[model samples]
Target: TVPAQLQFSAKTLDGHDFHGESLLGKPAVLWFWAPWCPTCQGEAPVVGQVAASHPEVTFVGVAGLDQVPAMQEFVNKYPVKTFTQLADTDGSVWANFGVTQQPAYAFVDPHGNVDVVRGRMSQDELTRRVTALT
Candidate 1:
């Protein structure tokens, strides 16, 4: 079974709690990142571009490891405005997914099966995976 944490309500930078409940019956990519992590900073644009290209697919970014100010600063520095960014400062979301590093990704298929990669990955790698989902 999918962890209940997969359905946890994560606060967004925009002040909304993103439970990602809408992603059911569809494939999705969940990006767990921190503003303080340089690897996440480098990966921001790459993920943003993919999210943009795949409107039918869901892409959610969970921002943690710091407060809103720093998360805002990180968002401002990156091209991540197109997608939803959630605040996981309390680390509940991270713990739920067993994610211990920045720039990690969890890919969920329509069947609710999850595949995770726990570190910086290439845009090409991102594309290949998303393509499979599509």
Candidate 2:
């Protein structure tokens, strides 16, 4: 079953409609961030690296609480362009996932279980969490 948190819809950075249900049946890492968030910017490199290394896990970046242009600029400045990036201008996706802050992460396993962690994560911590999904 798809987790309730992954039951919403949003537009991708590329202006394509994205269905959260598409993430079901796979281990996914939803990186929630804001364009002007310093902590998110600091962790962007690590998130990008770990995400690229783990080809088996699905990585989706949820950029919210800001405009699409800022979100696009953030992606262009950071190394987190290795995966899908969502433009959550209305913050609806964040509301659905119960994410109230930037630099949060929702780790969803194949069984539809979700573990959300707020704040910045070290490379090892991020890697361990993603590895567990395999």
Candidate 3:
């Protein structure tokens, strides 16, 4: 029960409804980011790059700590659209993950156990961690 059910239903970037529940049973990388934070912005490309490498695993972004318009702009600016990101306009998801800090990453194992990996990890580290977890 480290990070609990990596499953959730929320509005996506594209405005289409989706659910994270079906994505369970496979290792996943859930990243919490704020549009204002430079570190989170800096890691966007890396996250995109690393995420691309691990197609089998799920990679997500939770943007709520920031303003909605800004978050949407950032999502459009960064190379992160294919993957589903939660609109967490409120702090519900934030509290769920105990994510008081921005730019945190949660690595959930295939068995549905979560391995919390916080901060902006280097691309190599992201690759290694994802490989290990997946």
Q: How well is each residue in 61-90 modelled by candidate 3, as lDDT tens digits?
A: 888776678889989989887787878877
- Expressed as tens digits, the lDDT of each residue in 54-119 for candidate 2 is 989999999999898899999999998889999998989999888999889999998888899988
lDDT of 3 at 115: 67
lDDT of 1: 0.86
lDDT of each: 0.86, 0.92, 0.80
RMSD of 1: 1.5
TM-score of each: 0.93, 0.97, 0.89
**Can you tell me which runs of candidate 2 are displaced by over 4 Å?**
none
> In candidate 1, what are the lDDT values of residues 1-134, reduced to their tens digit?
55454677778899885775666678899999999898998999999999998887799998888999999999999999789888888998888788887879989888777788898889899988988886
Model 3: residues >4 Å from true position, as ranges? Answer: 1-3
Give the clashing pairs for model 1.
Answer: none
Q: Flag the better candidate by lDDT, 1 or 2.
A: 2
Residue 90 accuracy (lDDT) in model 1: 91
